[PDB]
Amino acid sequence: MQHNLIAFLSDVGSADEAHALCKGVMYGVAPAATIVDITHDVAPFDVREGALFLADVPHSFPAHTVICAYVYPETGTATHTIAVRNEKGQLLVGPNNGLLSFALDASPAVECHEVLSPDVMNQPVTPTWYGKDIVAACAAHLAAGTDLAAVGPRIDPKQIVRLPYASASEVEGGIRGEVVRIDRAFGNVWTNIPTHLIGSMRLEVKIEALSDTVLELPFCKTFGEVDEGQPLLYLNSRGRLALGLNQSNFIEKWPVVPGDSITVSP
Amino acid sequence: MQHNLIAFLSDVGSADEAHALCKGVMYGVAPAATIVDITHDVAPFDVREGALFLADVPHSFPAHTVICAYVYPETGTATHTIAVRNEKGQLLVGPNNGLLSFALDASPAVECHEVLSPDVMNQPVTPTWYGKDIVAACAAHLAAGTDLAAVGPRIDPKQIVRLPYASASEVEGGIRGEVVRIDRAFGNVWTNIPTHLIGSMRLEVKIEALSDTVLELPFCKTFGEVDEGQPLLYLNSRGRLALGLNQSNFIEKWPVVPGDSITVSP
Amino acid sequence: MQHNLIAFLSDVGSADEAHALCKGVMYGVAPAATIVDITHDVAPFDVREGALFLADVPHSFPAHTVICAYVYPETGTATHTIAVRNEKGQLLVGPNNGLLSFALDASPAVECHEVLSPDVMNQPVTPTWYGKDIVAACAAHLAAGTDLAAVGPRIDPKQIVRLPYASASEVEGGIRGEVVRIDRAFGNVWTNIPTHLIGSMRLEVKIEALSDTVLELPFCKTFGEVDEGQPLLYLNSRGRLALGLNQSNFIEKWPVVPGDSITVSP
Ligand SMILES: Nc1ncnc2c1ncn2[C@@H]1O[C@H](CCl)[C@@H](O)[C@H]1O
Ligand SMILES: Nc1ncnc2c1ncn2[C@@H]1O[C@H](CCl)[C@@H](O)[C@H]1O
Ligand SMILES: Nc1ncnc2c1ncn2[C@@H]1O[C@H](CCl)[C@@H](O)[C@H]1O
Ligand code: MET
Ligand code: MET
Ligand code: MET
């Protein structure tokens, strides 16, 4: 099945030609394809950050999409590239190192194969750039309509490496969660606390590390509901609880990092 | 009318997936469309900077263009999104907060509507991301050929919020103007002084704040007319007067900011 | 001959609209064209860096590609823009200041013309932006199928300015070379030492400036062959010798710059 829309993510940056050579390879194999960047500014080697960036990609993108993604410090070793068809019908290609975990939570694997066949690769294969020669090349082949079965042998979806993600839970108070990611352009803090856990309960937010700092925060539908510069709690596009300042940068005011505990209570 | 070329600007950056999810929504509604980024690195919340970046966009881009732009700290409140047809025939979609002001100076609004109809939106609409769910979604619908009248009710062009812009004027000497923007890649300074005001009159340039600094500058057609490192005055692509150093960075040598007065005389 | 794929490089950055106005001009002249960025974050005025970024572009990109590239501090002077057909069949447009040197090493010029004819330019031509009004505009015309002979007069390939590049040589030991570029996203160091010179000979690497620092390094096929954080020598995608740390940044650990000598011996 043709998938004329390739969505492309990596940790190689857009500041040099590296990412564009990959596209060069892709347009060569799939001249009908539209290539769109997700981002290339995933922090180096950071599989987790890459995986978070891919989470909402299945839902935002149409079914004829190939998600092409690589953050691959394991390039040129035993850790293989995989190719996947999800429940939506989209195709996904990347290293089997956890990168596709959160994309697959959004729309599970129906079929998966290890990418092993040289006919879907860019020959010769450079040991230090599987991203281009295997991931990108295979992604374009699948876009052009190559059968998923031709890429290599079938594997069970549990052979796909998954990244552990902490779930928010009820304590007495009391909801305990953590900082998942930071919306870097604005400095809004994203937690793992979903809509339904807070639905129960101005609220009290404790950020213990550091430094046992408590804030009394209003819950708003949007930023403009508090005065300029003032803090707020809101639910984001993903149904997760978030912290921000109206027209300012929250983490510059409260240097929280991913992993940090967030407790919210009446 | 089909407008297969969507030109896309925001303040969300390109360092994460946010801007690409918007494109995901757009390719879904308009699979025939070509999406090209203007830039996503408008400083956060900075409507003015966004508006300057859009100025030359009507003229540089063909008539079948939809200009899709959002810098929207007012997302999820009473400040609506608007959709506009200009005199060139282009379509423009963005928040009614001043963002489209300078694009509209270049090619005025012929027709404008508030974007209110749910059928041109991405349901459900997230209060904190009108950019994606209203601005991007509506832009794609108009690209695909949706009638502008279906987006919501007509409004008068004066109901479109405009940003004030200072005009350069003749004093005795003597031309008084100000710093509009900085060409950040190179550090060239852009003023609001047009070709015709200086046509009259090496020249003398005073930058009063700060610190009453006077420079004797040659007027050149281009950078290579003075020695490497030396300062010059020239007219830019926009017919505005500019200050630069040949193969160096002017603002790193003279820390001027937008708003600062520039006086030029014989 | 139609060349529907335009690959675009400059030093104007992607942080503002400048690069996108160029694309605006290109889609206008060539509505069938696909425009893909190589990168716009070439350091300002740095022709050499631009030229290195273009090296692998002929080989990575299909034959129907127009390579459109400008780093042009000589804009609006006697240094002309050139247009070139290479041995692969690709077309290249840029300033005659050395920028196309390394792209042309990969696939030599078969035909070259100075770009002089106003009918392949964007009128009126702004002296300070040949990038947009000549380079971009001509690139789109050639993409759309304009004959290369219509752009201006033919010239001999030796009238194309070439940048000098240092070759690695055998000494006694002993191979002497230098730092060519830094893989900035990761901090891997690229040398000019090819596969065949080291084929002869853990190895000893001396980086004399600075500060006569010697390292005993293993030669590996890829990063994961040494422990996390440890240094390695490997051959890259280009058949050049490279230095890196496994999942870390080499130049942050050893502040080498392009030009620096690298000596490798048993
Ligand atoms: N010095 C280094 N150590 C470990 N991994 C590295 C590396 N340089 C690049 N990569 C990794 O090579 C991949 C291309 Cl296949 C990129 O995604 C990047 O993660
Ligand atoms: N903490 C914050 N305060 C005010 N506005 C914010 C914000 N975070 C994002 N936006 C705004 O949300 C818009 C998407 Cl609709 C973006 O353009 C951005 O301007
Ligand atoms: N202050 C300055 N001095 C010398 N060259 C400059 C400059 N500002 C922009 N350019 C040069 O103008 C070109 C567009 Cl034609 C860009 O590629 C850039 O290299
Ligand atoms: C260091 S990863 C693979 C090397 C490739 N040449 C690149 O530019 O990233
Ligand atoms: C903070 S603005 C709207 C939120 C959206 N999730 C984003 O990535 O920007
Ligand atoms: C300074 S180079 C040519 C000027 C052009 N206006 C630009 O944005 O770069």
Side-chain angles (χ1 to χ4, degrees):
Chain A
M1 187 65 62
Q2 170 177 102
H3 286 66
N4 266 181
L5 177 60
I6 302 167
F8 188 23
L9 169 145
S10 82
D11 59 342
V12 303
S14 49
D16 69 11
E17 84 279 20
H19 75 301
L21 309 175
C22 289
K23 296 183 204 190
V25 160
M26 289 185 275
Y27 287 120
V29 174
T34 301
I35 301 165
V36 62
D37 291 332
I38 298 155
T39 176
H40 295 284
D41 294 309
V42 176
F45 330 119
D46 205 330
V47 179
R48 184 165 284 271
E49 173 173 279
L52 289 163
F53 289 175
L54 292 174
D56 204 53
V57 171
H59 161 77
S60 283
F61 276 77
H64 55 97
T65 310
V66 180
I67 292 150
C68 174
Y70 72 87
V71 175
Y72 214 155
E74 308 97 346
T75 172
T77 70
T79 132
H80 298 310
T81 297
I82 41 165
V84 179
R85 173 168 46 97
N86 68 16
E87 263 168 39
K88 192 168 169 169
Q90 295 157 336
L91 299 164
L92 301 94
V93 188
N96 193 7
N97 60 5
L99 180 62
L100 301 176
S101 293
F102 307 145
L104 296 175
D105 295 332
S107 187
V110 169
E111 198 179 333
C112 181
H113 293 247
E114 278 169 337
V115 184
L116 292 186
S117 160
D119 296 348
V120 303
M121 295 183 189
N122 184 66
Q123 299 293 322
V125 178
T126 289
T128 57
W129 210 356
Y130 274 21
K132 173 164 79 64
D133 289 338
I134 298 170
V135 177
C138 184
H141 285 279
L142 296 170
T146 307
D147 179 25
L148 170 55
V151 314
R154 195 163 183 174
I155 62 167
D156 287 330
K158 75 172 191 186
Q159 305 182 252
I160 301 167
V161 171
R162 310 295 284 249
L163 291 167
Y165 69 91
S167 292
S169 52
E170 294 175 301
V171 289
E172 213 49 271
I175 299 291
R176 192 185 193 86
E178 65 175 73
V179 182
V180 176
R181 59 184 283 186
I182 303 307
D183 199 5
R184 75 104 222 154
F186 311 108
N188 309 316
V189 174
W190 288 15
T191 75
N192 67 350
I193 307 152
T195 301
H196 75 262
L197 281 181
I198 48 149
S200 320
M201 61 229 68
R202 277 190 166 200
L203 304 182
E204 173 191 299
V205 49
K206 194 208 185 85
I207 308 158
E208 64 157 347
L210 55 158
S211 186
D212 272 350
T213 329
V214 177
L215 284 164
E216 204 189 60
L217 285 204
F219 180 73
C220 313
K221 293 202 162 185
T222 192
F223 311 101
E225 268 170 36
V226 298
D227 285 12
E228 322 70 57
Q230 287 300 294
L232 65 142
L233 297 160
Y234 64 104
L235 296 168
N236 64 14
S237 40
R238 296 230 87 214
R240 294 304 150 107
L241 194 65
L243 300 80
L245 305 166
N246 189 11
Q247 307 195 38
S248 191
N249 188 313
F250 192 94
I251 50 91
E252 282 175 11
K253 228 188 172 81
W254 282 283
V256 130
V257 295
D260 282 355
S261 295
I262 309 288
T263 318
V264 173
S265 35
Chain B
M1 187 65 62
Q2 170 177 102
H3 286 66
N4 266 181
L5 177 60
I6 302 167
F8 188 23
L9 169 145
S10 82
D11 59 342
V12 303
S14 49
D16 69 11
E17 84 279 20
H19 75 301
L21 309 175
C22 289
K23 296 183 204 190
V25 160
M26 289 185 275
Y27 287 120
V29 174
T34 301
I35 301 165
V36 62
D37 291 332
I38 298 155
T39 176
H40 295 284
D41 294 309
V42 176
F45 330 119
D46 205 330
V47 179
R48 184 165 284 271
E49 173 173 279
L52 289 163
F53 289 175
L54 292 174
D56 204 53
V57 171
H59 161 77
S60 283
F61 276 77
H64 55 97
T65 310
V66 180
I67 292 150
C68 174
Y70 72 87
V71 175
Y72 214 155
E74 308 97 346
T75 172
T77 70
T79 132
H80 298 310
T81 297
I82 41 165
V84 179
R85 173 168 46 97
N86 68 16
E87 263 168 39
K88 192 168 169 169
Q90 295 157 336
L91 299 164
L92 301 94
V93 188
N96 193 7
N97 60 5
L99 180 62
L100 301 176
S101 293
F102 307 145
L104 296 175
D105 295 332
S107 187
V110 169
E111 198 179 333
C112 181
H113 293 247
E114 278 169 337
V115 184
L116 292 186
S117 160
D119 296 348
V120 303
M121 295 183 189
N122 184 66
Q123 299 293 322
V125 178
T126 289
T128 57
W129 210 356
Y130 274 21
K132 173 164 79 64
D133 289 338
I134 298 170
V135 177
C138 184
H141 285 279
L142 296 170
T146 307
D147 179 25
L148 170 55
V151 314
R154 195 163 183 174
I155 62 167
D156 287 330
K158 75 172 191 186
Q159 305 182 252
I160 301 167
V161 171
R162 310 295 284 249
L163 291 167
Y165 69 91
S167 292
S169 52
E170 294 175 301
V171 289
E172 213 49 271
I175 299 291
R176 192 185 193 86
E178 65 175 73
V179 182
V180 176
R181 59 184 283 186
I182 303 307
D183 199 5
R184 75 104 222 154
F186 311 108
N188 309 316
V189 174
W190 288 15
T191 75
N192 67 350
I193 307 152
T195 301
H196 75 262
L197 281 181
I198 48 149
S200 320
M201 61 229 68
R202 277 190 166 200
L203 304 182
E204 173 191 299
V205 49
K206 194 208 185 85
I207 308 158
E208 64 157 347
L210 55 158
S211 186
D212 272 350
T213 329
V214 177
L215 284 164
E216 204 189 60
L217 285 204
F219 180 73
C220 313
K221 293 202 162 185
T222 192
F223 311 101
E225 268 170 36
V226 298
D227 285 12
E228 322 70 57
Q230 287 300 294
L232 65 142
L233 297 160
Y234 64 104
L235 296 168
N236 64 14
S237 40
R238 296 230 87 214
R240 294 304 150 107
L241 194 65
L243 300 80
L245 305 166
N246 189 11
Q247 307 195 38
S248 191
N249 188 313
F250 192 94
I251 50 91
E252 282 175 11
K253 228 188 172 81
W254 282 283
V256 130
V257 295
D260 282 355
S261 295
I262 309 288
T263 318
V264 173
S265 35
Chain C
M1 187 65 62
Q2 170 177 102
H3 286 66
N4 266 181
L5 177 60
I6 302 167
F8 188 23
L9 169 145
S10 82
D11 59 342
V12 303
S14 49
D16 69 11
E17 84 279 20
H19 75 301
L21 309 175
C22 289
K23 296 183 204 190
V25 160
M26 289 185 275
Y27 287 120
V29 174
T34 301
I35 301 165
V36 62
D37 291 332
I38 298 155
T39 176
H40 295 284
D41 294 309
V42 176
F45 330 119
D46 205 330
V47 179
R48 184 165 284 271
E49 173 173 279
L52 289 163
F53 289 175
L54 292 174
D56 204 53
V57 171
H59 161 77
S60 283
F61 276 77
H64 55 97
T65 310
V66 180
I67 292 150
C68 174
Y70 72 87
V71 175
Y72 214 155
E74 308 97 346
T75 172
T77 70
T79 132
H80 298 310
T81 297
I82 41 165
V84 179
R85 173 168 46 97
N86 68 16
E87 263 168 39
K88 192 168 169 169
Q90 295 157 336
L91 299 164
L92 301 94
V93 188
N96 193 7
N97 60 5
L99 180 62
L100 301 176
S101 293
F102 307 145
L104 296 175
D105 295 332
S107 187
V110 169
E111 198 179 333
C112 181
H113 293 247
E114 278 169 337
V115 184
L116 292 186
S117 160
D119 296 348
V120 303
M121 295 183 189
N122 184 66
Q123 299 293 322
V125 178
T126 289
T128 57
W129 210 356
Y130 274 21
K132 173 164 79 64
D133 289 338
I134 298 170
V135 177
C138 184
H141 285 279
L142 296 170
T146 307
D147 179 25
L148 170 55
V151 314
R154 195 163 183 174
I155 62 167
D156 287 330
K158 75 172 191 186
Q159 304 182 252
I160 301 167
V161 171
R162 310 295 284 249
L163 291 167
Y165 69 91
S167 292
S169 52
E170 294 175 301
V171 289
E172 213 49 271
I175 299 291
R176 192 185 193 86
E178 65 175 73
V179 182
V180 176
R181 59 184 283 186
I182 303 307
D183 199 5
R184 75 104 222 154
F186 311 108
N188 309 316
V189 174
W190 288 15
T191 75
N192 67 350
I193 307 152
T195 301
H196 75 262
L197 281 181
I198 48 149
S200 320
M201 61 229 68
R202 277 190 166 200
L203 304 182
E204 173 191 299
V205 49
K206 194 208 185 85
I207 308 158
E208 64 157 347
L210 55 158
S211 186
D212 272 350
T213 329
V214 177
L215 284 164
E216 204 189 60
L217 285 204
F219 180 73
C220 313
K221 293 202 162 185
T222 192
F223 311 101
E225 268 170 36
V226 298
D227 285 12
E228 322 70 57
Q230 287 300 294
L232 65 142
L233 297 160
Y234 64 104
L235 296 168
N236 64 14
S237 40
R238 296 230 87 214
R240 294 304 150 107
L241 194 65
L243 300 80
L245 305 166
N246 189 11
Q247 307 195 38
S248 191
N249 188 313
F250 192 94
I251 50 91
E252 282 175 11
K253 228 188 172 81
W254 282 283
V256 130
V257 295
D260 282 355
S261 295
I262 309 288
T263 318
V264 173
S265 35

